[PDB]
């Protein structure tokens, strides 16, 4: 009957299974989950500054369509487009639509710097029944519809603006594509318009095209929206003999620096989370996640797996 | 494990060990009792916590990205915008799968090492006064009261004390 001293290790009744290099199912005492699979279902307004267009997409907000009155001068870290956003104004298309909405979303600002232009020899502030603001004919709040002098000519526009500031100016303008040769002559008196916006280093010129388009808001015509950037020291020139949709100023090109747009339908709650997704916010300390590939902020890295168990204990052998 | 102590010559674990990860379990004249071992338990936890902290450092923070969902076919550009994201997700998924499997293989080997570490420490303590039964227990060839047992567990056991009794009981 000699004394014996034994050496061992702890164990538990129900252990956790983990993967290793040499086995798919090894039971260990304790393990932590590294893949986050849950979300709040609401977008947390902290610490990221959010902006809800909530009836207006970003571009409609930049142009100033009826619904987007609340978006003026807004600043954001994340703009939020909704699926319920609706066009409300004269029908328009935007060549390279995703590029101009990704410039407005990076800049993270709808601050419109208003400027006074002198469109010599044209009627101004035209409105359309397809763009109603309070049951009344309106237009884009940041665009000026120019038509011929009342019973007169479309005096040739040669307006210029020099960028004196230290920032890059983003000008939003457009070109009206009439529906019939009557409308063209009824509005600008030329048989064929022309819009040429230019800087010293880049230019763009458009001659409109008459024809029938599907009726949108009882309108068969269209407005093609364009944009021109102006660097400090450069000058922009709006030259047109017809069909010009003039600007009312410019936007300020800001720095990306957590500025983007997220297309979601979830309500903005009162929570706090440094990570947003299209499916809501993520609150976790885990490295990975299977919530959504769309992730904005300090987020876990999106993976395909739904569970990756890291072993935090020895081999469990009861 | 690479050392074959846990799930090896140590048959199974002790569920009565709730105050530590590694422990002693003796049988002397006065009776029987179990005590955890702090040093071995702490060394294992430090290396698990150490690799846990390494895996949490929040380094991923992007805001402006490329679109990852599309409401109309476009062709060349959309194909690329998709293929770029798919390529990234696959690579990160591999980076995660390999990380977990590798860290676990190391984790299990670390805990199997610390168990053998403790055993080898006690082996060197007695060092002619006991013998390795094989199951992780030492047959102490001398009377070892509770004060003697504690001396083995807090590292003050002087083998020269019992060397004369122990060798005699072993050889004959």
């Amino acid at each position, epitope marked *: 009957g000699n004394p014996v001293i034994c050496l061992g290790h*702890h164990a538990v009744e129900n252990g956790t299974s983990v993967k290793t290099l040499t086995d798919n199912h090894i039971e260990v005492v*304790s393990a932590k989950e590294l893949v986050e699979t849950n979300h709040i279902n609401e977008l947390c307004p902290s610490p990221l500054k959010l902006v809800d267009g909530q009836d207006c997409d970003l571009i409609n907000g930049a142009l100033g369509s009826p619904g987007c009155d609340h978006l003026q001068d807004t600043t954001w870290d994340v703009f939020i487009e909704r699926p319920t956003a609706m066009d409300t104004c004269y029908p328009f298309d935007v060549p390279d639509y995703q590029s101009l909405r990704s410039i407005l979303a990076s800049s993270g600002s709808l601050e419109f710097i208003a400027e006074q232009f002198t469109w010599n020899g044209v009627t101004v502030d035209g409105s359309s029944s397809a763009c109603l603001r309070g049951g009344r004919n309106g237009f884009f709040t940041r665009l000026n519809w120019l038509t011929r002098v009342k019973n007169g000519n479309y005096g040739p526009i040669n307006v210029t603006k020099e960028n004196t500031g230290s920032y890059v100016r983003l000008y939003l303008w457009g070109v009206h594509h009439p529906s019939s040769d009557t409308e063209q002559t009824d509005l600008y008196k030329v048989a064929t318009g022309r819009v040429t916006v230019s800087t010293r280093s880049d230019q763009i010129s458009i001659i409109p095209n008459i024809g029938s388009r599907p009726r949108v808001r009882n309108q068969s015509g269209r407005i093609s929206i364009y944009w021109t950037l102006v660097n400090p020291g450069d000058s922009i020139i709006f030259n047109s003999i017809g069909n010009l949709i003039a600007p009312r100023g410019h936007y300020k090109i800001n720095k990306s620096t957590k500025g983007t747009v997220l297309k979601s339908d979830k309500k903005i709650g009162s929570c706090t989370s440094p990570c947003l997704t299209d499916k809501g916010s993520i609150q976790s300390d885990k490295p990975f996640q299977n919530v959504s590939r769309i992730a904005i902020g300090n987020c876990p890295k999106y993976v395909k797996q739904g569970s990756l168990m890291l072993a935090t204990g020895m081999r469990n052998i009861p | 494990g690479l050392f074959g102590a846990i799930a090896g010559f140590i048959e199974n674990g002790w569920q009565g060990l709730i*105050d*530590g990860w590694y422990g002693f379990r003796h049988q002397n004249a006065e009776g029987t*009792g179990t005590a955890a071992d*702090l040093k071995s*338990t702490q060394a294992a936890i430090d290396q*698990i*916590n150490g690799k846990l*902290n390494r895996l949490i450092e929040k380094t991923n923070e992007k805001y402006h990205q490329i679109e990852k969902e599309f409401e109309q076919v476009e062709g060349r550009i959309q194909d690329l915008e998709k293929y770029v994201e798919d390529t990234k997700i696959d690579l990160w998924s591999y980076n995660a799968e390999l990380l977990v499997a590798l860290e676990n293989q190391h984790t299990i080997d670390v805990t199997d090492s610390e168990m053998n570490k403790l055993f080898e420490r006690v082996r060197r303590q007695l060092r002619e006064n006991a013998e390795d039964q094989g199951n992780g227990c030492f047959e102490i060839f001398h009377q070892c009261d509770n004060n003697c047992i504690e001396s083995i567990r807090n590292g003050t056991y002087d083998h020269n004390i019992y060397r004369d009794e122990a060798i005699n009981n072993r050889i004959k």
Partner: antibody
Amino acid sequence: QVQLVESGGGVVQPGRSLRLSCAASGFPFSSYGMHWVRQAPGKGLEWVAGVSYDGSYKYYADSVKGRFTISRDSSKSTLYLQMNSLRPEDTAVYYCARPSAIFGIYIILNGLDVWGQGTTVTVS
Amino acid sequence: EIVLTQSPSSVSASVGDRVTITCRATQGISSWLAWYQQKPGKPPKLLIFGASSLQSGVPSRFSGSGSGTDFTLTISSLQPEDFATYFCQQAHSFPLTFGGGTKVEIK
């Protein structure tokens, strides 16, 4: 829900004895080791005593070794701090504290999760 | 023993300042440090265990750092209720050591 209640603190003369008690509630007391930590009034926290889960291994501070005696009871789930040979150095606000459980083990040597309200011991 | 040394011993700051505190010991106490909050007349509350692991329910502004030799308790955006005295704890081996206290006053 889970908390620790202290008691026993009174006014006592040097050289005599007292017994302070710490009743647990809302957790498996007999599974955790436990600690007594005293905040000398004016100074910071000063660990004084600690005991294992079973009660066979007891750890004391060098200032109270052979003078104070810790003990516990599974049947009442209570922690006893039997103080003998008191002196004004031992004047302090006594706290019974619970070392944190880590991973799966209820270690005795860790940070302290739960504290009692604080029962003051005055020695004139 | 192991001797802890909190620096500074006291500090005054306004709400919203980047507060930094240090715990400083002798031995290799690996990663065993526990920071505590303490209001006057009240028992401590565990803020950080493992010297970096945030305690459950504690706001994310409290953060801990350090390993082995040099330790640090950082607070990003101080709040009115965060006015308190702070203690660090050694937990590598017995006996348990605490610090001299680092109180945050009003500026």
